[PDB]
Amino acid sequence: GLPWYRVHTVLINDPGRLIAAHLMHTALVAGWAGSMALYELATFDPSDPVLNPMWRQGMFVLPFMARLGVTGSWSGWSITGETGIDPGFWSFEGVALAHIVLSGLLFLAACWHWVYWDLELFRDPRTGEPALDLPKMFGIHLFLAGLLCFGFGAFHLTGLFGPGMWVSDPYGLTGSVQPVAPEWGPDGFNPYNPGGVVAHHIAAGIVGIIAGLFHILVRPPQRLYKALRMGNIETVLSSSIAAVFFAAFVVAGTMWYGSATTPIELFGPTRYQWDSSYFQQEINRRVQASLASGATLEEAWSAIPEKLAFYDYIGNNPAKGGLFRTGPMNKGDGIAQAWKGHAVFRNKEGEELFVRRMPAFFESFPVILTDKNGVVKADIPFRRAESKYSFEQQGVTVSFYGGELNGQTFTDPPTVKSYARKAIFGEIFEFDTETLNSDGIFRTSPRGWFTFAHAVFALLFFFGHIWHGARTLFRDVFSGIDPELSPEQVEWGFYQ
Amino acid sequence: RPFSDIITSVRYWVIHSITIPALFIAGWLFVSTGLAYDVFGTPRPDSYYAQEQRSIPLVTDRFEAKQQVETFLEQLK
Amino acid sequence: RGWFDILDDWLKRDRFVFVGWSGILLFPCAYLALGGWLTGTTFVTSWYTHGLASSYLEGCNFLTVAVSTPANSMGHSLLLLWGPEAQGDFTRWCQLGGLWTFIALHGAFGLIGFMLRQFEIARLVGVRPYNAIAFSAPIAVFVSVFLIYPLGQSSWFFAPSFGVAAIFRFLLFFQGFHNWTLNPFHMMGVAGVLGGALLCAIHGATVENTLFQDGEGASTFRAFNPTQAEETYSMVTANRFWSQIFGIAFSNKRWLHFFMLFVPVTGLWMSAIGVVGLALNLRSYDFISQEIRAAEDPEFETFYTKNLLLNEGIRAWMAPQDQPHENFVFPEEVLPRGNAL
Amino acid sequence: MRYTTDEGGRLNNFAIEPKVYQAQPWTPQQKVRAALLVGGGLLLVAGLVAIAVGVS
Amino acid sequence: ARRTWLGDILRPLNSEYGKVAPGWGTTPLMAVFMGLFLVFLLIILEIYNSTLILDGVNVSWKALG
Amino acid sequence: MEVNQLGLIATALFVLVPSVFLIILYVQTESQQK
Amino acid sequence: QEPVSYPIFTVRWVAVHTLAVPTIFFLGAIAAMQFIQR
Amino acid sequence: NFMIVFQAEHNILMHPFHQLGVAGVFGGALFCAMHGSLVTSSLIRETTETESANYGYKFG
Amino acid sequence: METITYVFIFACIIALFFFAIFFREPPR
Amino acid sequence: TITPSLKGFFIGLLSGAVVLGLTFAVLIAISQIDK
Amino acid sequence: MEPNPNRQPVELNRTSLYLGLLLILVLALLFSSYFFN
Ligand code: CLA
Ligand code: CLA
Ligand code: CLA
Ligand code: CLA
Ligand code: CLA
Ligand code: CLA
Ligand SMILES: C=Cc1c(C)c2cc3nc(c4c5[nH]c(cc6nc(cc1[nH]2)C(C)=C6CC)c(C)c5C(=O)[C@@H]4C(=O)OC)[C@@H](CCC(=O)OC/C=C(\C)CCC[C@@H](C)CCC[C@H](C)CCCC(C)C)[C@@H]3C
Ligand SMILES: CCCCCCCCCCCCCCCCCC(=O)OC[C@H](CO[C@@H]1O[C@H](CO)[C@H](O)[C@H](O)[C@H]1O)OC(=O)CCCCCCCCCCCCCCCCC
Ligand SMILES: CC1=C(/C=C/C(C)=C/C=C/C(C)=C/C=C/C=C(C)/C=C/C=C(C)/C=C/C2=C(C)CCCC2(C)C)C(C)(C)CCC1
Ligand SMILES: CC1=C(/C=C/C(C)=C/C=C/C(C)=C/C=C/C=C(C)/C=C/C=C(C)/C=C/C2=C(C)CCCC2(C)C)C(C)(C)CCC1
Ligand SMILES: CC1=C(/C=C/C(C)=C/C=C/C(C)=C/C=C/C=C(C)/C=C/C=C(C)/C=C/C2=C(C)CCCC2(C)C)C(C)(C)CCC1
Ligand SMILES: [Cl-]
Ligand SMILES: [Fe+3]
Structure with a gap:
C-alpha cells in the first residue's frame, strides 16, 4: 500500500487532479485571509491611535491592508486619526467580504476539475499519457506575471489609476498613502526611498514581458534538457522551493532591518x-x-x-x-x-x-x-x-x-x-x-513575529530543496526502471 | 608516484636535505628579528599601553577606523 | 569531442583524490578557510577589537588562542580587504578582525562544495545519496549560529570566535543571557544527540557478539568493502535477545539503519530552529505562573528560581569585560551576592 | 505510473517524461506565425516604455 | 477524455511537450545574463551594507521626508 | 499561578487531533485484509 | 591501474607542496617564539 | 542547577576528562549518522522465508 | 487542571508501553 | 564622479574575476595537454 | 463516471501506530508546560 507520508504521489501523472488540488489550497488561503481580517476587526479599537497604535493592539493583517491604500471603515472610523469619512466600497470590511466570496468560487471550480479530470488536452495525442510542455508553460506564465508587474507599478504605485503607497517622514510623526513617481538615478536602489520601489516595478515588469515573449518562441537546448532532467514536473518543484526560501530570507531581513515598505507606523520601531x-x-x-x-x-x-x-x-x-x-x-x-x-x-x-x-x-x-x-x-x-x-x-x-x-x-x-x-x-x-x-x-511586536516565523520556514524549505533535487537527479536510482526505455515487451534469452 | 616508497628515492635526499633547513631558518628569522610584530600589527611585549593614559584601545568608528588606530599607535598605545 | 568534454573527463579520472566540478569550489575555499584560522591563531592580535591577546606570538597556549571577532562599531560589515575600512592595508585588515569573516565565509562555501562533492560522487557510483542529506544537519547548525544569529544581533561582535576558550565562553554567555538549557528546542537537540550515541554503542556491541563463523574457519570470503558489514552477523539471534531483555526489538535491518540516520539529524535541525529563534531575542526564559506565585508568597523557592539567581550573577559579573565597548562600571555595592539576600 | 519497493508492499510513484524530439527546420507558415508575434511584442514593448517615461 | 471548446483552443500550446533544439543552442547568452546578474546582486547588497558608497545616496531613514 | 483555558484547549487539540487521525488510518487498514 | 609516467607538475605533487612549505615555515616560527624574552 | 553550580567551583570545561567525554558524544553521533546513511543506501532488499511461529532457513 | 494534564498524559504513556509489549504484531 | 569606495570595489571585482578566469584557464590547459 | 486508475490504498501497520502515538504523547508532555506557561 501507500505510506501515510506518500498520499499525494497519485497526482504526479494526473494533470486534472493536480489543478484541482492546487485550486483547493488557493481557496483555503483566501478563506484564511478573509476570516482573519474579520476576526481582527471585531477586536480592534481606533479611538486613540497616538497612545495606542495598531501594532500595540497586535494587528497582523490590518497593517498590510493599510500599506496599499485601505484607510477607512464602513463604521466611519479612520486610522489616520480622522473621524467621519466614507472610503467607498473598499474598507477593511470590504476586502474581507471579497476574499470570502473568492474562496467559495475557487472551491466550486476545484470540485469541477476533479470530476472532469480526463480530457483531450491533458493527454499526449500520440499515446494517451500525461504530457506537459514545461518550457512553453513557463513562458506564458512569465508573460502574465510581467503584465501584472507593469500594471501594478505604473497605475497603482504612481497613482495614475490607483491610491499609491504609504509615505512617511523619518520619525513617523505623520504618514499617509500618496502618489509616488519613480527614481531611475543611483538613488533608486536606496531602500529608504519609495521612488526606487516604483522604478523597480516598472522596469522589472517590462523585463518580464520580454522574457515571457522569449520563452514562448525558443525550445530548450539538447544538453541542458537531458542534464537538468526537463519534462519532469518534480524539477519545477525543487527550483520553486529554492526561489521561495531565498525570497523568505530577504523579506525577514528587510522587516528586521526596516525599509520604506516596512515603516514604523505600521509595525512599530526596530x-x-x-x-x-x-x-x-x-x-x-x-x-x-x-x-x-x-x-x-x-x-x-x-x-x-x-x-x-x-x-x-x-x-x-x-x-x-x-x-x-x-x-x-x-x-x-x-x-x-x-x-x-x-x-x-x-x-x-x-x-x-x-x-x-x-x-x-x-x-x-x-x-x-x-x-x-x-x-x-x-x-x-x-x-x-x-x-x-x-x-x-x-x-x-x-x-x-x-x-x-x-x-x-x-x-x-x-x-x-x-x-x-x-x-x-x-x-x-x-x-x-x-x-x-x-x-x-x-x-514582542508584529515585526518580531513575522521575522521569527519566516526565518524558521526559510530554513526548513532549504531542506526541502535538497530532498527534491535528490529525487530529480536520481530518479532511476530511487526507482528500478530508467525512463529512457519504453515498457518492456517480449523476452529473449540466451542459454547453453 | 605512491607514498609507499616516496621518501626512499635519491630525489628526496638531494633536494630536501637543503631546502628544509633554508625555509625553516627563514621561519625562525621572521620572529627572531621581530618582523611579525609589524606585518600583522602585533604590539610589542611592552607597548600594550602608552605612558599618556592607561586605557585600552577600542575603535569606535568603522570609516575612520584607520586613522583612529593610527592615532593609538602614534603614542605607543 | 569539444574542449568541454575533455575537461569533464579529465576531472573524473580514477585517482587517489577526486577533483570533480565540486572540487573547484571545495578545495581553494577549504584551504584558505583552514589556513586563515592557522595564520591568525598564530600571529593576529585582538588588542584592538576586544582588548585581549589571543595568539602564540603574544603568549598563549593551544586552548587559549583564537581568531576573534570584529569590534561592535563595524556593524554587519563584510570587511573586504579593498573595502572602505581597510583600504588595501593588510595590517589594519588583521587589526580590525577582518579575517574572522574571511575564515567564516570561505568555510561556508567550503561546506557547500563538500555536499556537492558527495552528490556527484554518489551519482558516479549510482547509489542513493542519503549521506549528502545527512550532511545538511551540520550546514543547518553552521549557518544558524555563525551567520544568522549575529545578523539578528547588532553586530558580528556577538558571533562566536574560532577557538577553544572563545567557544567555552559562548557556552557560559548563552547560559547567562538566554537561559538556553530551559528551551525545549535545545532539549530536543540533547535528546537527539544522546540517542545517537546510544544507538551507536548498542549496535556495535550487538553486532560484534552475534558474529557468524565463531566455530569453524571463515565461510565468508568477501567483503566487498562497500557493503560495510551486516552479512557478518545473524539478525535472528540479536532480535531474539532484545525481545526478552527490553521487550521490543527491530525485526527489519533496513529500518534499524534508517532510525540511526534519522535520530541525530532531526536532533540538529530542531536545535537550529531554536537558536534562529534566539536571534530575535525571543526567549523561553521564565514561566509566568511561577513568577507570579513567587512574587505573592516569597517563601516559595524552586530549583528554577535558583537558576535565575545564578544567571543574574553570570550576567552581572561577566558583562564589563565581555562588553568592554559599552563601558560598564558597576560599583561593588550594586553587584549581586549571596550574603546580601 | 511507476510502482516500486514492492518487496514489502510500500508503493512509490515517479513522474514519467515523454520522448525527447529533435527540432526540424522552419516552415514558411511557422515563420509568418512567429513574425506577427514578435512584431506584436515589440509594438507593445514600445508602448510600455512610452508609458514609463510619461508617468514622470 | 472529451472534446471541449476551450481544450482544443489551448491544444496547440501543449503539443510540443518534449522538443529540444540541437546542441548547446543559446547557452552562451544564458551565461552572460547569469554573470551580469551575479554582479547586480553584489552591487545592491554592497549598497545596502554600506561597503559601497555612491554620492547622492544615504542609506538611512533620512530622505523619506 | 494562572489557569489558562487556552492552555487546556491547546493541549487538548494537540493530543486529540493527530491521534484520531492515527487510529482511523489503522482501523480502515485492517478491513482491507479480508 | 593508474600506471606511472607523471612528471614534475601533477595533482598529488601540488597537494603535498601546498601543505608542506607553510607547515614547515610555521614550525620555524612557533619554534623561535619559545625563546622570546617577554 | 547541578551543572551550573558544579562548573562554578571545579571548572570542568577546562578539565580534559570531560573533553574526552564530549569528543566521544559528538563522535558517536557522527559515526551513527554515517553508518546509517552508508548501509541504508547499499541495501536493496532483504528476505527470509517465515513460517507460522519462527523464522526461515536462509537469511537472504 | 494542570497537574491533572501531567499525570493523565503519563498514564497514557505507560498504557502504551503495556500494549506495545504484550500485543505486538506476529512476525510474518 | 568616482569615490574611493567605487574604486576599491572595481579593483575587487576585477581581481576576483581574474582569479576565477586563471583558475579555469589552467584547468582547461592541463586537460588539453594530457587529453 | 468512470473510475480514476491512480487511486491507491493507504497502509498503516500496528508498530508504526505505536511509534506515532508515542510521538504524539511525548511531544504533548514536553510542550504542555509551555502551553500553560
Ligand atoms: C577559487 C575559489 C574562491 C572563491 C569561491 C572565493 C570567494 C570569496 N572570496 Mg576569495 N580568494 C581566492 C579564491 C576564492 N575566493 C584566492 C585564491 C585568493 C587569493 C588571490 C582570494 C583572495 C581573497 C581576498 C583577499 C578576499 C577574498 C574574499 C572572498 C569572499 C568573501 C565575502 C565577500 O564579501 O564576498 C564578496 C563577493 C566577492 C568577492 C565575489 C566577486 C565575484 C565575481 C568576480 C563575479 C564575476 C562573474 C563574471 C566574470 C562577470 C561577467 C561579466 C561579463 C559578461 C560582462 C568571497 C566569498 C574577501 C573576504 O574574505 O572578505 C571578508 C577578501 O577580502 N578572497
Ligand atoms: C556543549 C555540549 C556538551 C556536551 C556534548 C556534553 C557532554 C557530556 N557532559 Mg556536559 N556540560 C556542558 C556541555 C556539554 N556536555 C557544559 C557547558 C557544562 C557546564 C555547566 C557541563 C557540565 C557537565 C557535568 C557537571 C556533567 C556533564 C557530564 C557530561 C557527559 C557524561 C557522559 C554521559 O552522557 O553520561 C550521562 C550520564 C548518565 C548517568 C546517564 C545514564 C542513566 C541510566 C543508567 C538510566 C537507565 C534507566 C532509565 C532511566 C529507565 C528507562 C525506562 C524507559 C525506556 C521505559 C557527556 C560527555 C556528566 C558526567 O561526566 O557524568 C559522569 C556530569 O557529571 N557535563
Ligand atoms: C549535556 C548535554 C548536551 C548535549 C548532548 C548537547 C548537544 C547539542 N548542543 Mg549543546 N549545550 C549544553 C548541553 C548539551 N548540548 C549545555 C549544558 C550548554 C550550556 C548552555 C550547551 C550550549 C549549546 C550551544 C550554545 C549550542 C549548542 C548546540 C548543540 C547541538 C548542535 C549540533 C552540533 O553539535 O553542532 C556542532 C557543530 C557543527 C555540526 C558544525 C561542524 C562543521 C564542520 C564540517 C567542521 C569541519 C572542520 C574540519 C577540520 C574541516 C576539514 C577539511 C579538510 C578535509 C580539507 C547539539 C544538538 C548548538 C546549536 O543548537 O546549534 C544549532 C549551539 O549553537 N549547545
Ligand atoms: C506564521 C504566521 C503568523 C504570524 C506571524 C501571526 C502573528 C500574529 N498573530 Mg496569528 N494566526 C495565524 C498565523 C500567523 N499569525 C493563523 C494561521 C491563525 C489561525 C486562524 C492565527 C491565529 C491568531 C490568533 C488567535 C491570534 C493571532 C494574533 C496575532 C498577532 C498579534 C500580536 C499578539 O497578540 O501576539 C501574540 C502572538 C501570537 C498569537 C503568535 C505567536 C504564538 C505562540 C506563542 C506560539 C507559536 C508556536 C505554536 C504554539 C505551534 C507550536 C508547535 C509545536 C509542535 C511546538 C501576531 C502579530 C492575536 C491577535 O490578533 O491579538 C489581538 C490572537 O489572539 N493569531
Ligand atoms: C513547496 C511545496 C511542496 C510540495 C508541493 C511538496 C510535495 C511533496 N513532498 Mg515535500 N517538502 C516540502 C515542500 C513541498 N513538498 C518542504 C518544505 C519540505 C522540507 C521540510 C519537504 C519534505 C519532504 C520529504 C522529505 C518527502 C516529501 C515528500 C513529498 C511528496 C509525497 C506525497 C505527499 O504529499 O505526502 C503528503 C504528506 C506528508 C508529507 C505529511 C503531512 C503531515 C505533516 C508532517 C504536516 C501537518 C500540517 C502542517 C504542520 C500545517 C502547516 C503548513 C504550513 C505551510 C502552513 C509530495 C510529492 C515525500 C516524497 O517525495 O514522497 C515521494 C518524502 O519522502 N517532502
Ligand atoms: C530602474 C531599475 C531598477 C531599480 C531602481 C531597482 C530597485 C530595487 N530593486 Mg530591482 N531589479 C530590476 C530593476 C530595478 N530595481 C530588474 C530589471 C531586475 C531583474 C528583473 C531586478 C531584480 C531585483 C531583485 C532580484 C531584487 C531587487 C530588489 C530591489 C530593491 C527593492 C527595495 C528593497 O527593499 O531593497 C533592499 C533589499 C536588497 C538590496 C536586497 C539585498 C540582497 C540580499 C540577499 C539581502 C539579504 C539580507 C540578509 C542576509 C537576510 C537576513 C535575515 C535574518 C535577519 C533572519 C530596490 C528598490 C531586491 C528586493 O526584492 O528587495 C526587497 C532583490 O533581491 N530587484
Ligand atoms: C564539533 C563537532 C563536529 C565536528 C568537528 C565535525 C567534523 C566533521 N564532520 C564531517 C562530516 C560529517 N558530519 C556529519 C554529521 C555530524 N557532524 C556532527 C558534529 C561535528 N562534525 C554531528 C553532531 C553530526 C551528526 C548529525 C556527517 C553525516 C558528515 C560527513 O559525511 C562528513 C565527513 O566527511 O565525515 C568523515 C567531516 C567533514 C570533513 C570535510 O571535508 O569538511 C569540509 C569542510 C570545510 C572545507 C570547511 C569547514 C569550516 C571551517 C573552515 C571553519 C570552522 C572553524 C575551523 C575548523 C578552525 C578551527 C576551529 C576550532 C574551534 C578548533 C568533519 C571531520
Ligand atoms: C494544520 C491543521 C490540520 C492538521 C491535521 C493533521 C495533523 C498531523 C498528523 C500527522 C503528524 C505526523 C505523524 C508522525 C507520527 C507517525 C510516525 C510513523 O508512522 O512513523 C513511521 C514512518 C513510516 O514508516 C514506514 O511505515 C510503512 C507502513 O506505513 C512501512 O512499515 C515502512 O517500512 C516504514 O518505514 O516513518 C517515520 O515517520 C520515521 C520517523 C518516526 C519517528 C518516531 C520517533 C521515535 C518514537 C517517539 C520518541 C520516543 C522517545 C521519547 C524519549 C522521551 C524521554 C523523556
Ligand atoms: C462555497 C461558496 C461560498 C461559501 C464560502 C465559504 C463560507 C468559505 C469559508 C472559508 C473559510 C472561512 C476558510 C478558512 C480557512 C482557514 C484556514 C485555512 C486555516 C489554516 C490554519 C493553519 C494551517 C495553521 C497553521 C499554524 C499553526 C496551527 C500554528 C503554528 C503556525 C501555523 C500558522 C503554521 C460563497 C457563499 C461565499 C460563494 C459561493 C460558493
Ligand atoms: C455542474 C456541476 C458542478 C458545478 C459546476 C460549477 C457551477 C462550477 C463553478 C465554478 C466557478 C464559480 C468558477 C469561477 C471561476 C472564475 C473566477 C473565480 C474568476 C474570478 C476573477 C477575479 C477575482 C479577477 C480579479 C482581477 C484580476 C485577476 C486581475 C486584475 C483585476 C481583478 C482584481 C478584478 C459540479 C462541480 C458540482 C460537479 C457536477 C456538475
Ligand atoms: C589568509 C590569507 C591568505 C591565505 C593564506 C593561507 C592559505 C595560509 C596558509 C597557512 C597554513 C596552511 C599554515 C599551516 C600551519 C601548520 C601548523 C600550525 C602545524 C602544526 C603542527 C602540527 C600539526 C604537528 C604537531 C605535532 C604532532 C601532531 C605530533 C607530535 C609532534 C608535533 C608536536 C610537532 C591570502 C594569501 C589569500 C591573503 C589574504 C589572507
Ligand atoms: Cl544554587
Ligand atoms: Fe551497523
Missing part, C-alpha cells in the same frame, strides 16, 4: 533604532534648539510631542519579548494613557545626574546614576547594610518637566527610587493595567 539612540537624539535636539532661541525648561519640554516620547521607550523594542508569552504588547505592561513627562534627577549639591539606559540583552539591569563626565555618583544599591553612594547619602531628588507632572519635585527616597526604576526604560508613561490585567512582562 531594535536598530533604540540601540543607535535615534529618538533620544531627536528629542534632545528639539529641547536644545528651543532653549537656545529663548525658552525655559517648562516651555522647552512641553514642545516635545507625546508621539516622540512614546517611541523612545524600550517596551516597544521588538527584541523585548519571550517565546511563549502571548497576547498584544498592551498585555505586556498595560495600555498607555498619558505621558508623565521627562524626568530630571539631581543629587544634594545640585548637579544633574542621568540614569543609564538598559540594553535589550539584559533582562534585569542595575539602577546607576552617573554624571556627564562618566563617573558614577549615585545608585540604588543591592546591599541591605552597605552603602558608599545611596539615595539618602546623596539626597537624590527628581523633578519633572513636561507631560503631566510639570514643575513637580519629589524629595524623599522611595518615590524617587520608583522613578529611577522606570527611567532605565527611557521615558515614563502612565499605564492602565486594569483593562487587560497585564502581568508586567513584555511581549
